[PDB]
Symmetry: C4
Subunit: 274 residues, 4 copies
Amino acid sequence: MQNITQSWFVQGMIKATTDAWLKGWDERNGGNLTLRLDDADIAPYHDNFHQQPRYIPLSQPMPLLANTPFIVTGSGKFFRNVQLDPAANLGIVKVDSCGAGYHILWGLTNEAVPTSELPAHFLSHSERIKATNGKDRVIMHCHATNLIALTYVLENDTAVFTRQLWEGSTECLVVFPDGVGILPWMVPGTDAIGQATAQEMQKHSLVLWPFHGVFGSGPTLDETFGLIDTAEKSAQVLVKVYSMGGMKQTISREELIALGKRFGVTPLASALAL
Amino acid sequence: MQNITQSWFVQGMIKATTDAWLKGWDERNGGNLTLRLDDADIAPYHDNFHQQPRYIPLSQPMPLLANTPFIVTGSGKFFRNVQLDPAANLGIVKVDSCGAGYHILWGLTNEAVPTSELPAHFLSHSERIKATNGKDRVIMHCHATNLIALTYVLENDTAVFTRQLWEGSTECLVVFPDGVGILPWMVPGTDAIGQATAQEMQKHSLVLWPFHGVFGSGPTLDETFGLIDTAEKSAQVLVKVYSMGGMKQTISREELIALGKRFGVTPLASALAL
Amino acid sequence: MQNITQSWFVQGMIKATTDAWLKGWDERNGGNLTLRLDDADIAPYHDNFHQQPRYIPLSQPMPLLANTPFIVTGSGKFFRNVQLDPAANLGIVKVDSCGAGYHILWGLTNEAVPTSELPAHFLSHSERIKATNGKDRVIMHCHATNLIALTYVLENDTAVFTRQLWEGSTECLVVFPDGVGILPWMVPGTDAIGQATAQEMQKHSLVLWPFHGVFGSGPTLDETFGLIDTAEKSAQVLVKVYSMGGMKQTISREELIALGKRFGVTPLASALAL
Amino acid sequence: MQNITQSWFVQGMIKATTDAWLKGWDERNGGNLTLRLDDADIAPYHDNFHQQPRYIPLSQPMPLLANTPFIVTGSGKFFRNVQLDPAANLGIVKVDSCGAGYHILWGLTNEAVPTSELPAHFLSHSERIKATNGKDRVIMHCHATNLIALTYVLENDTAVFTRQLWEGSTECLVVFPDGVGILPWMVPGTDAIGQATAQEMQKHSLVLWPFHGVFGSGPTLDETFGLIDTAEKSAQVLVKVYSMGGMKQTISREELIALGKRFGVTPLASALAL
Ligand SMILES: O=C(O)[C@H]1O[C@@H]2O[C@H]3[C@H](O)[C@@H](O)[C@@H](O[C@H]4[C@H](O)[C@@H](O)[C@@H](O[C@H]5[C@H](O)[C@@H](O)[C@@H](O[C@H]6[C@H](O)[C@@H](O)[C@@H](O[C@H]7[C@H](O)[C@@H](O)[C@@H](O[C@H]8[C@H](O)[C@@H](O)[C@@H](O[C@H]1[C@H](O)[C@H]2O)O[C@@H]8CO)O[C@@H]7CO)O[C@@H]6C(=O)O)O[C@@H]5CO)O[C@@H]4CO)O[C@@H]3CO
Ligand SMILES: [Zn+2]
Ligand SMILES: [Zn+2]
Ligand SMILES: [Zn+2]
């Protein structure tokens, strides 16, 4: 019967991994993707399930994520190599009925462990479910060169950055009216990074990691890739003008106000007040 | 019989979207593209025609487009996904004999609707017919990377912008001798922007939307592609030259008239005299 | 028997135009390509030859190229379309035994004509056989993006321009030890500019045109592409470096002398004296 | 029997070189790749071995690489065509019993020879085996674009350059804590450049040739490609911020000191002082 790699939820993971590499966003093993799935999706594909689901004790249980299957990227794997050997780089995990751990059901072969950012992803996955009534399903991270470069020249404050990104295009304010988040620089690989990212998920859908990358949340794989792309497209325009001599004329504050009402969105009060 | 998807116009528009996709111009679902057809071009392919054509009334009467078939893209549809599904991403419509509505004949399945900028495309489609006596058949809009960044630095006046583009490459004066028209910033998706965009199309083949994108028209699918491609390359050279520190020697006014004299093209007097 | 499109030269021509389109030097219809053949090469493919060889006179006599066959690129064609229709974009011609005209034996279908730069392509062919004893066979023209931006800031002279290119990278001096020649601004498409280009071909294998493009020649297509490819890469570094604040350290004059002695090359006296 | 062209180490070569021509690194003939193999790897492919192995003496005796076969890329070959014909561009060699020369067993047809930087390969291959107890198996050289331009503006120091390369991205410190070697400008293709390059390999896994390129060494093909590309991404990040007017905030030393010991990594003490 049809291979599990030929299903919709694996083909989608293939495209987002390949296309984010050609753009130059996924040097080495940077970049991790986690997508929440449903039970009916994996029901007909019990044939390819492994005989022994390994058990890994999860650090601190999330009760809301009990009995929830997932798809994850293998830690240390390469995004470009996903299209070659999907089985060795992608795996499916499921959390037990109590929520204290997860069982690896398929993939992650050769004793491969899930991604090292699994804490931050799962803690932030739960919050987005309640904030938008369970519509968010994807958390993304990548090394976007232009957004990273802008962190070295501009202050890492949400209010200042939000106005700049909105000023770099017209579609931008429609895309992230809630604004973009930013942390202070923090050492990754720990559980402290999971809390600050999940805490910022409440008010924002994009949060920028200083000197590492960005984090974006969205319902589908396609829109999540397009969501980070839109801000990255505006990032390229901003960097060009700054090196060209400086910004001269732009969108007025009155012009930005008219945009919000026409499309029926509410711009951030903090950013628009600037 | 051979499917309509294997005809010349369906395959032709598949090329136009994919080529612009890799350029970095049409991320997410921005940009639009329409092409005018003939009754004879679609006569033998009535098999794929919808049994019941849905009816949608036009916002404002368009007498000049009565009983004319077009091919358009769908709203909220990415330019990447078209080659994966020609039927679910394109559509062919035929304006009624009165100029108030149109019927969807083929494509645009799953309650698909044409782009939200359809009034702007139909308004410019009609007015370019008067200027070119039916030669022009394509209207294209896309966010050219280097043209967007130029409006932040150069003044939004026809005389200044036209001369700078003529000096970034020798062939520019031959490709668009009429110059480029500049509009003031407006809220997209309304009807006010459609009337001003068509107003500049009477004397220009290239119209610039500040901070949003560019508009261009061409006789065929390939000529309109080169027109934007030629203008984009000129702006790319100007970006590096201006960013490198300044511009020291140039093509003089005496050389500009001599170049246009050989090829039989009349430059814009207001910008030439600058 | 395999048709002429399966010959070794036709397959080679597709490789050159296809890769130049991905590099970004042939927007719209810029660039031309011509290749020199031998009467023994086209012997087995006499069946494909047209029954009506169209005769076109030469602008000026070229006695040296008597009875010489060439394969050229048609005028007004897109380099991206060459890989799709070799017959309508390419063709073969043979110069008559007197040196005043040629006969179109295949290709250039539907009243297509060779490139308008043929007077420049043929005049430079003659002056390179004398300076190379019948070794060079290929002439290429392209609008190198990084080279055009250089002519707006650098002094338009043969000495300093050649010297600057030598410092871009180590291999630049070895590939073209004779330097490049740069003309004053002239209107393209005229015989007055072909003679100046052919005059500079006597001393150099690389020719520069301010604000327009580049000219190059080589033994075969792979060696001709490498000559232009190496030249543009050196320009890419300079534009990137110049915008950073100008050059600070570079290769000394004596250091290039040591490099020249090792590889048995004679650097240009004018440039090395700078 | 499966052809030699389908072997794992042959398919490794086709993947690594093709991924370098698409990144704009290997214009013309620049670049070469040598990978260490075992006798078991070449055992099943005895049928395709040449019956008359030509003997070529080595410049200097290499006892530490005795009886060790290698796969090499030919001299003067083009990285674009390797995928088109691996046999004519790739080759296999084996060191004799006394370590005085090598034999050609397969490939390198038509009097082809291994890359002219072969003495620079074996002098560094032998030393890297000692430092890492034989883990290293790949040597990579390529002309990265953004990397070269850094040498024209930054001081050519091992500690200073490594310090800057650490601040460009958070992953750079962990990937190469050992730093990157730097050398004075010297004439390639000589045994003197082989000694200096191999001499610095005792303390660093990467060496930078001013105005020329980079030298790579790692355990396998996949990591070796990502070993240099991590520095390439930091250079692209560095290049953009430099043209913006400088870098304003970054990772501080107090942030860097705690980063390594989180991963239990020993940083380069010389760069830590600055
Ligand atoms: O010494 C010689 O170079 C030659 O020098 C003197 O010639 C000068 C002319 O008097 C002067 O007007 C001018 O010539 C220009 C001419 O007026 C223009 O029209 C044009 O010429 C083109 C010509 O119209 C056109 O048909 C074609 O010419 C070809 C010709 O039709 C064809 O038959 C062949 O010519 C051969 C010729 O038939 C042979 O007899 C022989 O020619 C001898 C010639 O008989 C000798 O007297 C001697 O010519 C003197 C001439 O007498 C002076 O007045 O030497 C010639 C060479 O041995 O060989 C010819 C070659 O096979 O081919 C012709 C061509 O080569 O294709 O094309 C013409 C060019 O476009 O332009 C000319 C030049 O500007 O300048 C002359 C030079 O000072
Ligand atoms: Zn738009
Ligand atoms: Zn040209
Ligand atoms: Zn090199």
